[PDB]
């Protein structure tokens, strides 16, 4: 019944209620992925305005689309297990009718999809919520990493962030990675996620948790333990100096 | 005052008024000029084309409904659109369930009835666009002018568009002329031309900028651009 | 508030007036037409150096003989390209011949007045008209080369030669004394990635600019990065001679 | 034409306030002061008959009226929505009830239904809350007597004895002194009267006082004779000369 | 028009929060006090009764602690009309789990859905969100004892230990303080009745004034039982813990 | 019909699906996989209708693997054929049902035993130690009332079958172009993929 | 029970020349055994030079022509004027006859 | 406050509708149109006003029947009036077509009454900027009646609505007082046509063109016709001859 | 904040102003209107004011013919005065198609207040700002009059009155009733009960009544009817003859 139009157009060409939704998404915790030569790490900031949770049932921030490909986001909580829920299922859909996976640019141009049609739909607003939308296409070793924002856009990035202080890490980022020698090991695509992470985290061994995709459905999330060896190696590099 | 009861359609201002559809209006002066005129054998529409850039096109003005109808606008073209296509239906209705020609007074109860529906109901908006209406029917020719106001007027001849009070002024002079130009349609065309010019004052009318259309005895509605138009010019 | 399809003091309509706004701060497109073809070109405009450049896909294929480029909010244009697309296969397989130029894009426009929150007229759902124009280029039989300017207000304009986006006004002082009626497909090619070079805010390159092309006998193809970087190399030649 | 009001007309204020249920209950406030008590075998409901002029019959006029012939209901605020509050009642208790299991609704689920018809007048699109208190009192087979109280927000509590409405403070006070766990109907009734004499400004007496009772079944209620289960309604609406009677020994 | 008169309920601040959200929890911040804590062998559910009268019949009285499933307890802090309309829903899921698949509901599962009921009225539709925030306490034969949390904008939790309603700041660093991982039930019981009874805004922590539920498995049967504390057994464990 | 056929061992389920598609006069294929993995420890094999037969299975596998990925969990082999009983008892009563039989055996790791139901496009579900859909229970029934025992190790299942299909090959009038045969244990689902002369 | 269908005989033959097409069938309607007319034109002028004809059932055959003359005038409106070629009517008279694959057009046509 | 004028279906504090009296002015601002009961039907007569010589004499006629019995005449928003008009028409053919007897005129009279009170009952809809004067010969007797955008409607001996009402009603009253046995139909048209003269005063700036039709059970049957050729001619010289 | 006085929501006060102003508008005609039950009958008096010399008096009319039986008099506007009474008609015969019998005049009248309180709490809707008096001789109740308002209020009277100066006829009437000591008219013929009526209404207004002042409606057992000019003059006469 209700169709009221949120989402309209302002005297300077601008939709409000989009704009404010990216005001959410910087609002979120910190989501950050980074591509190597043959996998892609996808690191994401944990709160601590409490501190008293069960990490085994809480959400994950880093959830699976299909065993293939992963999604991250920023912002509102809420939000995005909708557009989880909507990709999962259109995944299933279309394993069903092509016979073969999505691939990462499908799965994502299909979630930027549904956020946009949140931005001119009557009685909806938009989505508080931006995604990191990271795998491999089927039987294929190229990484894939893309990106969605409320406005509906998106693209494909070597290494991006959203999120609080997204600023500031994807400055590390941009003076970190170089695009002829991408991190051709799992191991120093996971050091330079952590390091980005450590410029906004500040000290946070259980604020920081990574996740690394493979080819042919190769996910695996890493423990507070393999995570904090790393923080422990990367705080030499600056004590070393 | 104005501002406090032009939010919507379904708002009457303390002193009677409808802005909304007012503002409609407005859409139609802020358009380009056309003309037309009816002699007792032939209608006749003449309008003026304008152009954005000089690289752009002159967007097109006159629509065809049926053999024996059809308008020219002034103001939003798509609205224009709508209603011409949906002139076209009733020409078509007509024709397939009666096996009759649709009465051009009948066409204009018709655009009236759908313009007043817009300017009644909440969430809808008038119609930004005027149209003339010419036609050929079982009554001999004819000449209509259409107001997004609903309303809907028969005339011998008539002007829409910026500075159309020119093209207005000049008919409603030659009137007792070309009410008598009976059986010679170039003598009518050249009238409605003459009746157009006295509404310019940027340019001069080209060969791609003139427009015109026409109806009559044994004259399917046809409109003519271009090359056709230059023993006009 | 006031509704989202209200009449403006002045006799236009507030949302499509605003859409038009949000068009102003868009990436750069421009077309050029020929009698030897269309010559689409955009600015990618990356915000960022890690952004893959080449997924920026803002000229994209409608049919083989009708192509378009976007300038604006992108994302609304997906659902546009989708119409077209549907528009001009479904007319395909009715007439089994293709679409007019024209004919598509006046069905591409048929959309733009598709909004409100419930105007009386058949069943217009969407809160907002289009944030994007659109430069839809193509070629057919009765008309040959066609460049169109598709609007949110509904209205299409054929332009000879046509700028949209941010440096639209300037591009298209410059459309107007550069292009002639007999143009070859080179010169246009050269002259569209001239005058993106000027409005750019970037150094144009082969990376943060697109060309693309229409003609009778290929249809529409994306221009490769390399065959692109050959004619800017070509361009800068031809202005550093004089 | 058409309901174009689909959204909430009750929204949650910067303070965390509901604005139209806190005016709802401020309505309910102004109203006439209804009670209720229960006793150790019964319950009884009892508010003033504000005749709003003398020239009306006051008879044709219940503030008190039966749900179901074990459950009876009171209010205080405005009569218009208590009264098509008590229609939606009555039949939801058949609707939702008695069509499905054969018997009527125990006090408590019968009050549940009521409380969510309120509680949607909370939140559905372009409505406001209703603009009364209900003082529900029942019996059924394994609860025993209960009496309720429902708010124009949607809440429901069970009481031991309340009032509501214009001195609801003052006769709730009062109440507070005169229970106690060990109460005969009877002295419940007495207690009632007593009570809402310091609510009644004018005249006192069985016609411009409405009281009824949820008592022992009334087989002389029942109109047939014959089902040995089916022993009579435990509602009943005392008569005007049954107040009087208990008004002489006040 | 209508459009006057619309709230717009579901729409962004210039800061990018929701308004409705906002202020709906605004308002369940002056609801009762309710406190879960899990345990190694069960959970408990404690909650401050908001306003109470020597009238009020506490015996039939329940407007805290609600029974979802067998497994499936709630506490509740807010609007308790708003609240029995997502506990019916959530009890119609429960049972249509049951139906399809044959086995009881997984708490999360549970959870989740009426978490994605709240966000719906967050997102579209126009109405005010459910002025309420649930504490699930729960078992299944995967996460064993299984505690969470949900709001008005409908997004969910897992816990240890945590509190909503009145003074959940002051409320959880008082658990924060004496929580332990190897803790035992009737240590959580003591837990939860001393937090409250710090908690509270009213004069002393009575009976009359509290509701009491624990989810144990029962060594002698193997099978877990829910328990909402009677009157009298919450006068009882009131005094043994040192409260009188 | 087709042949559908399945036995519960000591420690799996064993799957026997004939490999013949029969169109009217002729034999289109001989090498059809008539099963369909749902989870990593859940076959389903499947007979009936013509086109209903895929579609449905297809459907099933679909439902399943989107619960997988939703709760990253493995549904019981129990929990999944109610699901599918309930598919199919919505089915019968539609505006045209799915007329589709079907065995699944699952191997359950919480329980660490195999088990197998069988469901007809009624929704008609129970659990069998040996179970068959259309004309083959009537001949191999008998047979598994004979030899059958819970004990018996996968090698033993499988000699079973291989006597339930010899039996198959003797008595019924339809060439069904042999059988696909499946294990289904706590390692998974393999094929035995040497079974036309085991 | 009522029959929708019913049957008016008459026969329709088309040529194709070189540079020239001929589409002919007889003037006579019948039913049963009776006749309903000597001249009932059943070929006709569409437009855009196409002669069409749809023999069989009349009511369907006009009322497919009715459709296809009228699919024409559309064609032009939708299309600048666009002359409608032979085999692009071919095709839209599949869909109008599939339009009906369920309540079929009782008539053969031939343009 | 104030903004009681900015919704249709508000009360104002003194029980007033002001978007229906706003609607009125549109009327006011109309051409004058009027109606005249006689002893066996009714007239009915408007000002048609000549904007320019470009307008086709006897062309745009105002004047609209309902089914073929009643007339219909209005003054202000043309477009409205006609939109009543079709809703008429179709409320007439509704009538005949259960009860086979063509619509008596106070049903029909009631028909459009509660169509047009419709439109004051709700903010999403616009009242009616026409007052309209119709009637017709029925079953026994002639009927005339004027609806106003309120809604409102009562049998008149005389109506009028629009620029010159006053002049046209105190021509009316005259009418009223020196023909107590009542008007015929041949003289209530040529009166029709004086009034009419007299009326356009108000707006003697532009030239008019006048438009009669009448019902009379003796003169067209009881069927409503438009007065045309000599009958027309011989009304307007009687009007121009007592213009001066 | 300051729109709850434009729809039918509740005010800081508890209050719905649009009902309030709903009832404002039921003064609008400046006419008045009393009711009275006989022993076997039940009679409305209204005024009639017809101030255009142009109108037709027998089309001017505020007292209605529900059912056969049921009698109802609006005060408040014709356009909303005809909205109810329509509806009521209509809900009157769909009664009797339903349930077999005829629709007892207090039945209507909860009815219509139901009707009128959706109005109280549903935003898209207007009160009809109209106050409905229903008359009849019910089969089960005797002489009956039940009154309706725009807040969807209603309750049954031994005798009323409505208008602007309501006030003096309920008081007039009260002193009666206190003096006569009993709840009706004492009188066998309607004619002396609309007499009573006529007296009342001259006594409490104090004005003098012409035939063409007044407008009366009889409800007797199994009909409803309205008197005409000269019924009323007959009574006019009658009360004449005593003063």
Same mark, same amino acid.
């Given at each position: ?241 | ?233 | ?242 | ?11 949650? +204020?910067?303070?965390? #306030?509901?604005? /139209? ?6 309505? &309910?406030?102004?109203?006439?002061? @209804? !009670? ?75 009050? +549940?239904?009521?409380? #969510?018809?309120? /509680? ?6 372009? &409505?406001?809350?209703?603009?009364? @208190? !209900? ?116 | ?244 | ?198 | ?111 | ?244 | ?243």
């Amino acid at each position: 019944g209700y169709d009221r139009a949120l989402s309209i157009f302002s005297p300077d060409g601008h939709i409000f209620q989009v704009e404010y939704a990216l005001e959410a998404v910087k609002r979120g915790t910190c989501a950050v992925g980074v591509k190597g030569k043959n996998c892609v790490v996808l690191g994401c900031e944990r709160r601590s305005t409490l501190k008293l949770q069960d990490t085994r049932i809480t959400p994950s921030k880093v959830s699976k689309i299909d065993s293939h490909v992963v999604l991250s986001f920023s912002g509102l909580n809420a939000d995005s297990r909708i557009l989880i829920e909507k990709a999962r299922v259109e995944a299933q859909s279309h394993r069903l009718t092509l016979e073969d996976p999505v691939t990462v640019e499908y799965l994502t141009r299909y979630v930027a999809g549904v956020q946009q049609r949140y931005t001119q739909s009557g009685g909806v607003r938009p989505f508080g919520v931006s995604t990191l939308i990271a795998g491999f296409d089927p039987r294929d070793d190229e990484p894939k990493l893309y990106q969605t924002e409320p406005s509906g856009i998106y693209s494909s990035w070597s290494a991006q962030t959203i999120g609080r202080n997204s600023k500031t890490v994807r400055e590390f980022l941009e003076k970190n990675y170089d695009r002829k020698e991408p991190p051709a090991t799992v191991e120093e695509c996971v050091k330079l996620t952590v390091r980005s992470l450590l410029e906004v985290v500040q000290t946070g061994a259980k604020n920081i948790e990574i996740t690394v995709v493979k080819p042919d459905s190769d996910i695996v999330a890493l423990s507070s333990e393999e995570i904090n060896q790393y923080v422990t190696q990367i705080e030499q590099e600056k004590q070393e100096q | 005052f104005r501002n406090n009861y032009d939010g919507d359609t379904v708002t009457f201002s303390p002193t009677g008024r409808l802005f909304q559809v007012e503002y409609a209006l407005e859409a139609i002066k802020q358009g380009s000029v056309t003309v037309g005129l009816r002699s007792n054998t032939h209608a006749v529409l003449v309008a003026l084309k304008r152009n954005a850039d000089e690289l752009s096109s002159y967007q097109k003005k006159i629509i065809k409904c049926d053999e024996h109808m059809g308008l020219s606008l002034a103001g939003l073209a798509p609205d224009a659109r709508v209603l011409s296509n949906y002139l076209r239906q009733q020409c078509n209705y007509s024709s397939l369930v009666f096996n009759r020609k649709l009465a051009v007074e009948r066409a204009g109860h018709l655009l009236c009835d759908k313009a007043q529906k817009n300017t009644q109901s909440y969430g809808g908006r008038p119609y930004g666009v005027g149209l003339l209406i010419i036609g050929y029917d079982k009554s001999g020719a004819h000449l209509l002018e259409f107001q997004p106001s609903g309303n809907v007027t028969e005339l011998y001849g008539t002007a829409i568009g910026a500075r159309s009070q020119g093209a207005k002024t000049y008919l409603e002079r030659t009137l007792d002329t070309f009410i008598k130009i009976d059986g010679n349609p170039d003598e009518l065309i050249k009238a409605g031309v003459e009746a157009i010019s006295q509404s310019l004052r940027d340019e001069s009318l080209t060969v791609d900028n003139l427009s015109i259309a026409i109806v009559g005895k044994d004259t399917p509605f046809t409109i003519y651009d271009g090359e056709a138009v230059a023993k006009y010019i | 508030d006031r509704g989202v399809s209200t009449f403006s003091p002045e006799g236009r309509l507030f949302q499509v007036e605003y859409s038009l706004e949000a068009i102003k701060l868009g990436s750069t497109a421009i077309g050029i037409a020929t009698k030897e073809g269309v010559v689409l070109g955009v600015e990618k405009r990356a915000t960022s150096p890690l952004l893959e450049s080449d997924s920026i896909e803002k000229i994209v294929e409608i049919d083989r003989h009708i192509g378009c480029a976007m300038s604006g909010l992108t994302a609304d244009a997906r659902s546009m390209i989708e119409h077209a697309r549907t528009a001009a296969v479904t007319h395909n397989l009715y007439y089994d011949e293709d679409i007019n130029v024209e004919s598509l894009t006046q069905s591409v426009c048929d959309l733009a007045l598709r909004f409100g929150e419930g105007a009386s007229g058949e069943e217009r759902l969407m809160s907002r008209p289009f944030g994007v124009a659109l430069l839809i280029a193509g070629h057919d039989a009765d008309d040959g080369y066609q460049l169109f300017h598709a609007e949110p207000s509904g209205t299409f304009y054929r332009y000879n030669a046509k700028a949209i986006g941010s440096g639209s006004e300037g591009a298209q002082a410059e459309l107007l004394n550069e292009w002639h009626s007999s143009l070859t497909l080179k010169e246009a090619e050269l002259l569209v990635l001239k005058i993106l070079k000027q409005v750019m805010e970037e150094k144009l390159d082969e990376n943060n600019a697109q060309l693309s092309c229409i003609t009778k006998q290929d249809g529409f193809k994306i221009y490769d990065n390399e065959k692109t970087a050959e004619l800017i190399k070509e361009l800068k030649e031809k202005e550093a001679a004089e | 034409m058409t309901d174009r009001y689909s959204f909430s007309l009750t929204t949650f +204020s910067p303070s965390g #306030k509901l604005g /139209q249920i806190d005016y709802a209950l401020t309505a &309910v406030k102004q109203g006439v002061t @209804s !009670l209720g008590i229960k006793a150790t075998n019964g319950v009884v409901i009892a508010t003033e008959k504000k005749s709003s002029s003398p020239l009306a019959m006051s008879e044709t006029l219940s503030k008190v009226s039966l749900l179901t012939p074990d459950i009876g209901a009171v209010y205080s605020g405005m009569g218009p929505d208590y009264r098509v509050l008590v229609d939606k009642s009555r039949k939801v208790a058949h609707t939702s009830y008695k069509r499905i299991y054969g018997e009527y609704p125990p006090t408590k689920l019968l009050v +549940s239904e009521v409380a #969510k018809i309120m /509680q949607e007048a909370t939140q559905s699109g372009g &409505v406001r809350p209703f603009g009364v @208190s !209900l003082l529900i009192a029942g019996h059924d087979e394994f609860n025993g007597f209960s009496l309720y109280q429902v708010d124009p927000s949607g809440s429901y509590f069970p009481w031991k004895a309340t009032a509501i409405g214009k001195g609801s403070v003052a006769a709730k006070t009062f109440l507070e002194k005169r229970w106690n766990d060990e109460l005969e109907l009877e002295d419940a009734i007495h207690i009632a009267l007593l009570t809402l004499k310091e609510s009644v400004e004018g005249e006192f007496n069985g016609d411009t006082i409405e009281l009824a009772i949820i008592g022992d079944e009334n087989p002389d209620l029942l109109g047939y004779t014959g089902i040995p289960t089916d022993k009579g309604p435990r509602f009943r609406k005392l008569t005007s000369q049954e107040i009087n009677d208990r008004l002489e020994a006040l | 028009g209508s459009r006057r008169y619309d709230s717009r309920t579901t729409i962004f601040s210039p800061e990018g929060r929701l308004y409705q959200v906002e202020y709906a929890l605004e308002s369940i911040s002056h609801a009762g006090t309710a406190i879960g804590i899990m345990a190694s062998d069960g959970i408990v559910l404690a909650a401050e009764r908001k306003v109470t009268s020597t009238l009020l019949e506490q015996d039939t009285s329940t407007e805290k602690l609600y029974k979802l499933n067998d497994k499936i307890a709630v506490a509740v802090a807010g609007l308790t009309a708003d609240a029995e309309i997502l506990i019916n829903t959530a009890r119609i899921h429960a049972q249509n789990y049951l139906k399809t698949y044959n086995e009881d509901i997984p708490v999360e599962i549970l959870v989740r859905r009426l978490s994605d009921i709240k966000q719906g009225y967050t997102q579209h539709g126009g109405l005010r969100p459910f002025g309420v925030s649930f504490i699930y306490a729960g078992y299944d034969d995967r996460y064993g004892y299984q505690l969470y949390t949900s709001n008005p904008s409908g997004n969910y939790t897992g816990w240890k230990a945590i509190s909503v309603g009145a003074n959940t700041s002051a409320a959880q660093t008082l658990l924060q303080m004496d929580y332990k991982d190897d803790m035992k039930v009737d240590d959580a019981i003591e837990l939860a009745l001393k937090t409250l009874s710090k908690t509270t805004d009213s004069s002393a922590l009575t009976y009359d004034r509290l509701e009491f539920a624990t989810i144990r498995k029962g060594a002698n049967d193997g099978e877990v039982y829910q328990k909402i504390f009677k009157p009298q057994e919450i006068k009882d464990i009131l005094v043994k813990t040192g409260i009188t | 019909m087709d042949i559908i056929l399945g036995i519960r061992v000591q420690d799996s389920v064993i799957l026997a699906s004939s490999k013949a598609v029969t169109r009217g006069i002729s034999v289109l294929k001989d090498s059809d996989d008539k099963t369909r993995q749902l989870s990593p420890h859940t076959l389903m094999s499947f007979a009936g209708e013509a086109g209903d037969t895929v579609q449905f299975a297809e459907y099933i596998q679909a439902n399943i693997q989107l619960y997988s990925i939703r709760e990253d969990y493995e549904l019981s082999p129990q929990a999944v054929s109610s699901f599918v009983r309930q598919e199919l008892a919505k089915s019968i009563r539609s505006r045209r049902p799915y007329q589709v039989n079907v065995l699944i055996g699952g191997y359950d790791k919480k329980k660490n035993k195999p088990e197998l139901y069988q469901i007809d496009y009624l929704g008609t579900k129970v659990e069998l130690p040996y179970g068959a859909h259309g004309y083959s229970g009537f001949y191999t029934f008998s047979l598994l009332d004979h030899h059958y025992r819970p004990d018996m190790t996968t090698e033993e299942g499988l000699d079973l079958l291989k006597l339930c299909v010899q039996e198959l090959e003797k008595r019924m009038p339809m060439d069904f172009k042999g059988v696909i045969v499946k294990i289904v244990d706590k390692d998974g689902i393999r094929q035995v993929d040497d079974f036309q002369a085991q | 029970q009522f029959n929708p269908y019913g049957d008016n005989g008459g026969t329709i033959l088309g040529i194709a020349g070189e540079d020239f097409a001929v589409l002919a069938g007889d003037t006579r309607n019948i039913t049963d055994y009776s006749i309903n007319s000597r001249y009932e034109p059943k070929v006709f002028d569409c437009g855009d030079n196409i002669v069409m004809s749809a023999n069989g059932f009349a009511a369907d055959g006009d009322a497919l022509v009715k459709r296809f003359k009228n699919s024409v005038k559309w064609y032009h409106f939708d299309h600048n004027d666009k002359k409608l070629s032979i085999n692009s009517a071919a095709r839209n008279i599949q869909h109008l006859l599939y339009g009906k694959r369920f309540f079929p057009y009782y008539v053969h046509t031939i343009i | 406050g104030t903004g009681y004028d900015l919704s249709n279906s508000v009360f104002s504090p003194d029980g007033r509708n002001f978007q229906v009296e706003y609607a009125v002015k549109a009327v006011e601002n109309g051409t004058t149109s009027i109606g005249i009961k006689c002893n066996d039907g009714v007239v009915f007569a408007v000002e048609k006003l000549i904007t320019s010589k470009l307008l086709v004499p006897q062309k745009n006629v105002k004047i609209q029947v309902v089914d073929r019995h009643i007339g219909c005449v209005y003054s202000g928003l043309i477009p409205d009036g006609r939109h009543l008009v079709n809703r008429g028409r179709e409320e007439a053919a509704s009538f005949k077509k259960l009860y086979k007897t063509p619509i008596p005129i106070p049903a029909f009279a009631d028909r459009l009454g509660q169509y047009v009170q419709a439109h004051t009952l709700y903010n999403s809809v616009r009242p009616f900027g026409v007052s309209t004067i119709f009637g017709g010969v029925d079953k026994n007797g002639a009927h005339l009646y004027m609806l106003e955008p309120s809604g409102s409607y009562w049998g008149y001996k005389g109506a009028a609505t629009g620029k010159g009402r006053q002049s046209a009603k105190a021509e009316l009253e005259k009418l009223v007082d020196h023909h107590p046995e009542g008007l015929s139909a041949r003289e209530a048209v040529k009166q029709a046509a004086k009034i009419i003269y007299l009326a356009h005063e108000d707006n003697k700036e532009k030239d008019f063109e006048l438009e009669i039709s009448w019902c009379s059970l003796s003169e067209t049957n009881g069927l409503h016709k438009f007065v045309k050729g000599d009958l027309l001619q011989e009304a307007i010289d009687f009007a121009q001859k007592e213009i001066n | 904040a300051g729109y709850d006085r434009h729809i039918t929501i509740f005010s800081p006060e508890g209050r719905l102003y649009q009902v309030e102003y709903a009832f404002k508008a039921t003064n609008q005609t400046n006419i008045n209107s009393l009711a009275v039950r006989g022993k076997d009958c039940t009679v409305v008096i209204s005024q009639k004011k017809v101030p255009d010399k142009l109108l037709d008096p027998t089309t001017v009319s505020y007292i209605f013919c529900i059912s056969r039986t049921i009698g109802m008099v609006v005060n408040g506007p014709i356009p909303d005065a005809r909205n109810a009474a329509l509806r009521a008609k209509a809900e009157a015969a769909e009664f009797r198609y339903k349930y077999g019998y005829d629709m007892p005049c207090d039945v209507l009248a909860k009815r219509m207040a139901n009707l009128s309180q959706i109005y109280t709490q549903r935003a898209y809707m207007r009160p009809l700002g109209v106050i409905l008096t229903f008359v009849s001789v019910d089969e089960e109740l005797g002489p009956s009059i039940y009154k309706t308002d725009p807040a969807g209020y209603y309750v049954g009277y031994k005798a009323t009155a409505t208008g602007p100066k309501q006030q003096e006829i309920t008081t007039n009437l009260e002193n009666h009733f206190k003096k006569s000591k009993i709840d009706h008219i004492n009188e066998e013929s309607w004619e002396k009960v609309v007499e009573f009526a006529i007296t009342h209404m001259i006594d409490a207004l104090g004005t003098e009544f012409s035939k063409n002042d007044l407008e009366v409606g009889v409800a007797t057992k199994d009909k409803f009817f309205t008197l005409s000019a000269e019924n009323i003059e007959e009574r006019l006469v009658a009360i004449a003859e005593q003063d």
